[PDB]
Amino acid sequence: KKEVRKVRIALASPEKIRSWSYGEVEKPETINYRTLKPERDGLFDERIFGPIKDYECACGKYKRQRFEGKVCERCGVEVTKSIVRRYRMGHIELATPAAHIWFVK
């Protein structure tokens, strides 16, 4: 409930990467036409990122607020509005390191 009085930029530790992270996008699959739903692990999967929809999950096993903090037994979807979907971050575990061009150039 405190007042924000100081901001600070600091480099990121690989572990902090994962720290902020949720899931790893490992495939270039945006959305499959048939169903405008996230393809697989893809850049849009709801696990790695969040509930594409309001309070409802992917398949629809659990759909309201009563069980707001639990994950679906067959498919993984914890749900707040699609807002949790826009705030959560995912991570990609690179094979062999590369570097921030921000610090190199």
Partner: protein, 554 residues
């Protein structure tokens, strides 16, 4: 009190009126002045309709002397030609001499046309609007009744042939097409000039935004002395500076020290009203004062911020500045507007000289806020700082800057340029370390902190020898303490790179950084001096005292 402040001995011009409102402002009070404003507004409008002044083609009256002056100068042109056809005048002298002939002949038809109205038609529909602060420009009226004479070629070399016509009679076929080039070159002018007015403002604001009034009379009594006389117009002859400019310098300022002049004792810290600045001028006239000690942001103590006695009077209101006011910004905005006001009105309405005026200033005011060897080395600040020192650069920049704006009609109080230029020297380089390595550019006042406790509280006098650094407004904004501010203009790319590396803790002070957050402004109602203030009713005053009285147990 109404006749005391009014001059009923002349026709009311915009200036006589301008003067009346101002007077009324100080004398009777803000809202009372507002009443007078509408009053003149109303009657001015009414009388305007009834006066029946209207333009008629015939109204634009051409002087009979026009034909003469033209012919007089015409035959003289032939002299200069014959003088050329023989081999006397060089290809150049020929040109330079022709131009001067018209430059004068035009100026001649100018005063002529007015002389006609003055003597013959006192109430010419066209003439009254120009004299009154209404509408019209001396160079403009000339193009209608007199004649607009010289329109330069695409490049810049003015044409050898003038435009013998006025707008009264048909400006001919080719004289139109030639004038047309001068219009094309202008329209472009305002575009670049409008962009550098915003440039000037962003720069001024980016360096000067943290500067805010939060204080107690800053006890550091060090100041700037405003000169009333100027050195070389004519080789060496001392002269009283122009009324307007001197007023600009000391109006509503605060004496840094007490001055006894013509008979009266101007006390220290007293805010000099325009009447007081009138006194000092009358004294210098007598020969009693050559400069004036006055509080200026140029010598304030408050590291971040300027106090009430250092700034002065002018809030939008006429009384001393109220703590928690966004001065710097006001200054920045005030320098931006004048830039954005003068280059858009000159491409839009009229000629030769004015085109040079605007284009030369905009480059100069861009080279003056940013530090670089001027085009023709005019004189370079960095070098000047090193050779003659700081206190001279500060006073040089201010005056050299007012030079262009005075020359363009704008009247901005020195206050503003000061607030800015001070920030261009809020930094210094180090030559004798203590805490961190020598070569470094850091916050001047932050050094005052180190050296202060280094010799006073903790022993071991490790003198932190610095060198005054004169950074330009731009560079100051670029490289400041907080990153938020820096992330705003220069390179977001760079700004953050550095600020990250070194975990930077942006302490929120200043309006730019704190706005980004959408947090309350550290200045204004957020101002630490009044962010906290409670109100009470004599009814709730007793009630709380009844709570303290119940504190006595058993």
């Amino acid at each position: 009190v109404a006749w005391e402040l009014i001059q009923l001995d002349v026709p009311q011009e915009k200036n006589s009126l301008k003067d009346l409102v101002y007077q009324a402002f100080l004398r009777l009070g803000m809202e009372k002045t507002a009443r007078l404003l509408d009053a003149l507004k109303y009657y001015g409008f009414t009388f305007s309709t009834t006066s029946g002044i209207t333009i008629g083609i015939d109204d634009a009256v051409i002087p009979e002397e026009k034909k003469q002056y033209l012919e007089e100068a015409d035959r003289k042109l032939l002299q200069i030609e014959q003088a050329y056809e023989m081999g006397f005048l060089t290809d150049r002298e020929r040109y330079d001499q022709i131009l001067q002939l018209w430059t004068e002949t035009t100026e001649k038809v100018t005063q002529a046309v007015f002389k006609n109205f003055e003597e013959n038609y006192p109430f010419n529909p066209l003439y009254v609007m120009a004299q009154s602060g209404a509408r019209g420009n001396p160079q403009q009226i000339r193009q209608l009744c007199g004649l607009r004479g010289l329109m330069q070629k695409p490049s810049g070399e003015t044409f050898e042939v003038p435009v013998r016509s006025s707008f009264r009679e048909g400006l001919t076929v080719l004289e139109y097409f030639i004038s047309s080039h001068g219009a094309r070159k202008g329209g472009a002018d305002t575009a670049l000039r409008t962009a550098d007015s915003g440039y000037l403002t962003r720069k001024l604001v980016d360096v000067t935004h943290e500067i805010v009034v939060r204080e107690a009379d800053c006890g550091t009594t060090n100041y700037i002395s405003v000169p009333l006389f100027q050195p070389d117009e004519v080789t060496r002859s001392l002269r009283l500076r122009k009324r307007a400019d001197i007023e600009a310098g000391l109006y509503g300022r605060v004496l840094a020290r007490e001055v006894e002049v013509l008979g009266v004792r101007l006390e220290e810290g007293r805010y000099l009203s325009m009447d007081d600045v009138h006194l000092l001028i009358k004294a210098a006239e007598a020969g009693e004062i050559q400069e004036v000690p006055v509080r200026s942001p140029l010598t304030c103590q408050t590291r971040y911020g300027v106090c009430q006695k250092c700034y002065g009077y002018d809030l939008s209101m006429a009384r001393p500045v109220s703590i928690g006011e966004a001065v710097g910004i006001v200054a920045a905005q005030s320098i931006g507007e004048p830039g954005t006001q003068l280059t858009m009105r000159t491409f839009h309405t009229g000629g030769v000289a004015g085109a040079a005026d605007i284009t030369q200033g905009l480059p100069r005011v861009i080279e003056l806020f940013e530090a670089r060897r001027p085009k023709a080395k005019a004189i370079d600040p960095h070098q000047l700082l090193e050779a003659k020192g700081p206190e001279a650069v500060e006073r040089y920049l201010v005056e050299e800057i007012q030079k262009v704006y005075r020359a363009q009609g704008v009247k901005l109080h020195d206050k503003h340029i000061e607030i800015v230029v001070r920030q261009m020297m809020k930094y210094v380089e180090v030559t004798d370390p203590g805490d961190s390595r020598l070569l470094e550019g850091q916050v001047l006042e932050k050094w005052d902190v180190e050296a202060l406790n280094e010799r006073l509280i903790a022993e071991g006098k490790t003198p932190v020898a610095w060198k005054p650094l004169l950074m330009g407004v731009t560079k100051s904004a670029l490289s400041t303490k907080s990153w938020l501010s820096a992330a705003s203009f220069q390179n977001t790319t760079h700004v953050l790179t550095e600020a990250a590396i070194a975990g930077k803790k942006d302490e929120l002070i200043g309006l730019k950084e704190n706005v980004i957050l959408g947090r309350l402004i550290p200045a204004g109602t957020g101002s630490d001096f009044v962010r906290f203030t409670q109100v009470v009713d004599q009814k709730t005053l007793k009630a709380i005292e009844e709570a303290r009285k119940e504190a006595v147990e058993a």
